[PDB]
Amino acid sequence: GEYPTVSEIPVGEVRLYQIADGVWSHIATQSFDGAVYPSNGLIVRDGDELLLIDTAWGAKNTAALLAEIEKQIGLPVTRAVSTHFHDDRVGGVDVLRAAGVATYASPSTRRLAEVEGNEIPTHSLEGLSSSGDAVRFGPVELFYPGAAHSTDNLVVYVPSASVLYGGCAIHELSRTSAGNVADADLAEWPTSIERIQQRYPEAQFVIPGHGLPGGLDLLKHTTNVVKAHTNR
Numbered sequence: 001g002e003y004p005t006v007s008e009i010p011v012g013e014v015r016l017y018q019i020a021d022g023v024w025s026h027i028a029t030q031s032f033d034g035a036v037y038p039s040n041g042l043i044v045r046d047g048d049e050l051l052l053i054d055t056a057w058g059a060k061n062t063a064a065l066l067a068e069i070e071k072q073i074g075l076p077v078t079r080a081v082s083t084h085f086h087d088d089r090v091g092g093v094d095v096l097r098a099a100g101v102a103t104y105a106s107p108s109t110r111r112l113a114e115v116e117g118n119e120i121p122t123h124s125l126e127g128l129s130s131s132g133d134a135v136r137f138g139p140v141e142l143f144y145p146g147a148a149h150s151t152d153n154l155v156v157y158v159p160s161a162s163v164l165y166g167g168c169a170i171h172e173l174s175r176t177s178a179g180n181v182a183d184a185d186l187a188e189w190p191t192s193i194e195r196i197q198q199r200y201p202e203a204q205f206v207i208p209g210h211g212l213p214g215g216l217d218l219l220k221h222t223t224n225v226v227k228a229h230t231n232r
């Protein structure tokens with residue numbers, strides 16, 4: 001009840017929100033490009049362990065995230081997947097690594113993180129090189145839909161809970177602009193969203209990279225906003 005918003009989270013703190021049985025989002029905030037933004041990740045129960053999707057945008061936040069997970073859930077985080085190479089997704093990987101978490105990303109994400117100067121997940125995910133590729137990874141499916149917010153961006157589906165985590169490829173309804181498009185492929189982004197729509201029509205909950213969860217309408221919303229941005 002009441003998903004937390006940016007005014008409810010001081011930078012440095014992390015909230016968890018149970019989305020469904022064995023699926024939570026984590027929500028943190030950060031100062032960026034002259035504003036304060038919220039950021040979501042995902043936590044998925046993996047037997048008696050946890051699979052983490054994305055850091056909490058930095059070392060300080062990610063430390064808070066690990067503490068909050070122990071406090072509220074009390075199962076160990078054994079694996080983490082970063083869904084693209086920007087700092088809101090890999091920033092805090094070293095904190096995860098030091099805590100004994102195995103960190104993963106596609107080869108493309110690892111390479112781009114290195115070029116950018118960001119933290120580099122240790123493990124490489126295989127089978128996600130080409131638009132339309134999917135692989136099972138523990139209790140989720142990882143899907144590379146094609147370039148969108150970034151050329152490497154992955155989305156994550158939790159089949160047991162019908163939860164689709166879009167990361168920064170999916171915008172919340174409140175957002176009217178396409179966000180930070182410095183590394184985006186605006187031309188491909190609607191096509192990549194269509195691949196997601198066609199693959200996961202059964203999604204009940206859709207979690208954007210930043211802001212409020214909704215339903216599958218978030219996909220249409222994203223292509224609306226992305227097209228409007230492209231057009232000026």
Ligand SMILES: [Cl-]
Pocket residue numbers: 111112115
């Ligand atoms: Cl490259």
Ligand SMILES: [Zn+2]
Pocket residue numbers: 084086149150168
């Ligand atoms: Zn990004």
Ligand SMILES: [Zn+2]
Pocket residue numbers: 086088168209210
């Ligand atoms: Zn983002």
Ligand SMILES: [Zn+2]
Pocket residue numbers: 173220221222224
């Ligand atoms: Zn809309």
